[PDB]
Ligand binder design. Structure first.
Ligand SMILES: [Co+2]
Length: 9
């Protein structure tokens, strides 16, 4: 989730 979220942002 960490990288999914930061990628999205
Ligand atoms: Co990763």
């Amino acid at each position: 989730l960490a990288e999914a979220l930061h990628f999205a942002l």
